[PDB]
Amino acid sequence: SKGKLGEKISQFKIVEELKAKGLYAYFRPIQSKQDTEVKIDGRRVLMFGSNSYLGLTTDTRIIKAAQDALEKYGTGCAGSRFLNGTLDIHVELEEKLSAYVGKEAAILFSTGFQSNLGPLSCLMGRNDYILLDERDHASIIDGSRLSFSKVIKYGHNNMEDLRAKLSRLPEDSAKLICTDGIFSMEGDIVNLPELTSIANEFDAAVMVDDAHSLGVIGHKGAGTASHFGLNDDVDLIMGTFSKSLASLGGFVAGDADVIDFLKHNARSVMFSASMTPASVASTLKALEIIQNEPEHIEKLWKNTDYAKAQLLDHGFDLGATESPILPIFIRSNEKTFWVTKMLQDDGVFVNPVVSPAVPAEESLIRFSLMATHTYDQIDEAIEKMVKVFKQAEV
Amino acid sequence: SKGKLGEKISQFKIVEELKAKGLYAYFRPIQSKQDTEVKIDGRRVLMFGSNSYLGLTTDTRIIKAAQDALEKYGTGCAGSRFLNGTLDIHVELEEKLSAYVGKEAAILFSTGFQSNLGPLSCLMGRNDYILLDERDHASIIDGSRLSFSKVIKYGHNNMEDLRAKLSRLPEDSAKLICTDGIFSMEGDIVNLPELTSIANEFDAAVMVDDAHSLGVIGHKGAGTASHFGLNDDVDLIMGTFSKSLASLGGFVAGDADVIDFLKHNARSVMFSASMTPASVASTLKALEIIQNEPEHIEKLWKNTDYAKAQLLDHGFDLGATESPILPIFIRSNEKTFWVTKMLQDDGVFVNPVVSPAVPAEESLIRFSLMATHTYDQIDEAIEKMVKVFKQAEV
């Protein structure tokens, strides 16, 4: 029945208003492969709103690996890994990932999102604590909400706040600290050296979400622990396959005893169907390419260094990024929606960040680089962004 | 740091004991496509533990549709539907599903699990209520736990308990009832006529999880509302693609205003990458086949009717199933593990249900039919199950 349900959704008017104003730019229907240019409404559009940092979703070797896995294994496994949904290739990918990030063991999940739900829901329980950076990804907040533990946010990269909040807690309790490696909003990197120094002092477990770090920082892109040399101080490395690795799914890697506990106790792996064969094979092939072909990471960072330099030269106000995410401040929700749609209509795709996710005065567009971007494409996009910022009176 | 973490996992010994006893049969690595026979350890094994009810994960047309989508769209969309992860084909599949289940609109999710997290987390909030059948799927309990509402379980298909618990609640509050359509443990069907009669009396929203119903019950397999004629009394129809539809992902269909609220407010769709092109195309092609080719559903039910008849004739104790899930009672965890492994070693794959998920005295194996099963295969499996139950002294 719909009476109260209709009242619950009645005040959600922003989409109706965006659409009526001709500003709506969510769920833009792409007609082509994710690439440096995409087709929308039959038009070519420069893509600066992707997470495919290495441009690998078009790599013919990865496509062929996926197509061959469809030929051999079919379209799906039709059950949880726990029961009838494990393939030899899922186990192969776990062993490969474990080697890549320097851990004993890994368990796959069908999404990155579910990869955070699993360890955050089941390791800390009643009388225990989870400590979260306040800017942690939504999947980390949700995973921690599924635990029976007490969840505590600390100030963004605020090690004094982290230390203070841990110091308060009963000694006879388990604690887990979970942090993004690279935070996606502002593109900044966790202070892992101090965070792990505090974790070591308080015997708290450390989990790092490397969704934006894998294929980006660390040796051969192995992520945030790898970038700092702190493999030995990080209990659990989580990653997704939907960004650099060009696929869908995720993992958690760690000590064989911890991973064996997760794979038999995490509801998001016991009660959800396993990764499709095609996504296992594309992740496997992408992982090989990232390590074997150093040029992809190198070119991502040449693009990043060039674009950031060009943006600061043109006087754009950037966030404190240390990554291929270039947050460009606009500081008005109305202007952020206008700039986003005007760019779309001039053939540039960027992602808006608005209230209520951020304060109006911190509203911004996110401009993300891919290894496959050319300097010519970057220059075109920035030329068009200078014009739209002028038109918009930012 | 690992001291307290090691203590949290220290008492989880069942896997170590199963493995040391030679009884472990979780995460069995399959080497071949999900089918009526699978290869494990280079041996052929009859598969009676699948959720691929129509056997479609091997359909060459569905494989080719997926391979063609890889060719056209690449290996992934590399972002949320909300931002850069929408394809024309995701929208096509939403329109197709909406038509199939008789609703205005649908939103895809990258897993079935996430399809329950979305509406349960974001529609009911503070001062509202979610009412859950006590046997609801784990993803429904977790989705409801992510809401800021008060979550209330009612007795399994206990309409007097449902009515009583609703009657207690403040009138000035929103209520949502969420139920599995077909419950996977015992294979039973929700009492949707009475549940919707109560929902209508109390103006409570109705959500049905049709993971095991789509491709199984209702006109041309359209699910539980379709089976009862109660499309008009069900607000939200959720489904997965990982069972009859031979793929990965899920959806929620409903009124265009409710679905537009979800697709902009559900964290599991705004903050998780979209379905892979290959899984969109396999779901599209599978959906066509289920409707165009009535023989698949017909043969599922001929197999179901035959196997259930043969099991009751041999004197097996079955659960109160109304579906292709044939729960066979064993009523000892030790015997359930022994029977499961002895079947595996004789070339039969079945799924155990044990403590702590059920009481020891309700432990069982689940024997699930596929349309592609032959009577000869069913007969072989039952002959082997009679022998193992004898060997096991059940």
Ligand SMILES: Cc1ncc(COP(=O)(O)O)c(CN[C@@H](C)C(=O)O)c1O
């Ligand atoms: C009733 C029900 N709802 C929702 C889901 C989640 O759908 P996905 O597997 O597509 O995420 C399942 C999963 N079932 C299997 C996996 C199980 O519980 O073993 C289910 O049985």
Ligand SMILES: Cc1ncc(COP(=O)(O)O)c(CN[C@@H](C)C(=O)O)c1O
């Ligand atoms: C830090 C972080 N962790 C985890 C996830 C979830 O991974 P999957 O998308 O593979 O489920 C994301 C998703 N990001 C994108 C989708 C976003 O938030 O728009 C993320 O940014």
